Design a protein around this ligand. Structure first.
Ligand SMILES: O=C(NC[C@H]1C[C@@H](NC(=O)[C@@H]2C[C@H](F)CN2)CN1C(=O)C1CC1)c1ccc(C#Cc2ccc(CN3CCOCC3)cc2)c(F)c1
Ligand SMILES: [Zn+2]
Length: 297
């Protein structure tokens, strides 16, 4: 029987918000069965908790933000990506400030910290959202789709008219490939002319070559370049896996992104949730016949 997972031990990390530039103390705690991923602003009195669910997603343009009243948690997608990748169902994420720390701009540091601490199987069936019908959303030339698939796979395409863009297309079947190996280390990227604008608007305050691929007109400015030839589209898949986990359960299905980002990802989740014909919740009493498997805890 495929069991729910939480953390074996507490994880503590320190970092900077990409946008806020604020120093932030992060604590990941075990949580009981059927808790889900709950973010917790522990710098406030009282403490403000926000389940990492589609219903709590704020209307911002820079990253995935969770909101309850006018309290926010910015840039949740890379951490939620790591949680999704390692099959963590239940955890409390405590933050000393409004923004998840950016770390190296990937999920690599999160997956390392979590796998260092280890994982704990819990005595309850892991619940999955199975895609039963195609659900798509469009806005201009951008598309995001859910397709039925006996497993979990993400296909992504970006199309920048830019000398730096390499393959802009990638597909990964996670039933037969590591989230860790393939996608976790893939860093966010910023173009010089966007970074200049965002800086002029007091955004990108934490950004550096240490936590982002910096792309001018022609080339990566980072001194050690790219971690993968296809790091850009790999990072888009990382962002998708993070937004997909706002469903609050691992997906049995395929996601296809074409020039998609968090706004359209959020639109897809909300239409999927609304269309109960297109999805159901399943458990697996026998992992040997399940279409997905997880790493030894
Ligand atoms: O939002 C940024 N990139 C968005 C990229 C990545 C991807 N989205 C994601 O990954 C989502 C969104 C979040 F990124 C996380 N998940 C999709 N996407 C796009 O579609 C872009 C074409 C629009 C971004 C990244 C780094 C910095 C940065 C920075 C920075 C600022 C200053 C300096 C200092 N420089 C020193 C040298 O002289 C210039 C300044 C260095 C880096 C920044 F200001 C902005
Ligand atoms: Zn990202």
């Amino acid at each position: 029987m495929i069991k729910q997972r939480t953390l074996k031990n507490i994880i503590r990390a320190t970092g900077v918000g990409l946008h806020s530039g604020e120093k932030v103390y992060l604590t990941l705690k075990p949580a009981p069965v059927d808790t889900g991923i709950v973010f917790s602003r522990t710098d406030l009195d009282p403490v403000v908790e926000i389940p990492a669910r589609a219903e709590n997603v704020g209307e911002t343009t820079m990253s995935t933000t969770l909101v309850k009243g006018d309290v926010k948690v910015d840039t949740v997608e890379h951490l939620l990506s790591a949680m999704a990748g390692l099959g963590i169902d239940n955890a409390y994420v405590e933050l000393s400030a409004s923004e998840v720390p950016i770390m190296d701009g990937s999920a690599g540091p999160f997956v390392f910290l979590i796998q260092s601490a280890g994982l704990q199987e819990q005595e309850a069936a892991k619940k999955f959202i199975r895609i039963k019908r195609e659900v798509s959303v469009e806005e201009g030339d951008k598309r995001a789709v859910f397709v039925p698939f006996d497993g979990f796979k993400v296909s992504f395409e970006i199309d920048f008219d830019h000398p730096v863009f390499r393959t802009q297309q990638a597909s990964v079947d996670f039933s037969s490939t590591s989230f860790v190996k393939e996608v976790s280390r893939a860093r966010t990227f910023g173009f010089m002319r966007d970074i200049e604008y965002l800086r002029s608007q007091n955004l990108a305050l934490g950004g550096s070559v240490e936590n982002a691929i910096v792309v001018d007109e022609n080339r990566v400015l980072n001194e050690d370049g790219l971690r993968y030839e296809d790091e850009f589209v790999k990072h888009k898949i990382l962002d998708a896996i993070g937004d997909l986990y706002l469903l609050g359960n691992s997906l049995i299905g395929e996601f296809r992104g074409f020039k998609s980002g968090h706004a359209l990802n959020n639109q897809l989740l909300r239409t999927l949730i609304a269309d109960k014909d297109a999805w159901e919740v399943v458990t697996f009493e026998d992992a040997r016949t399940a279409p997905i498997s997880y790493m030894r805890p």
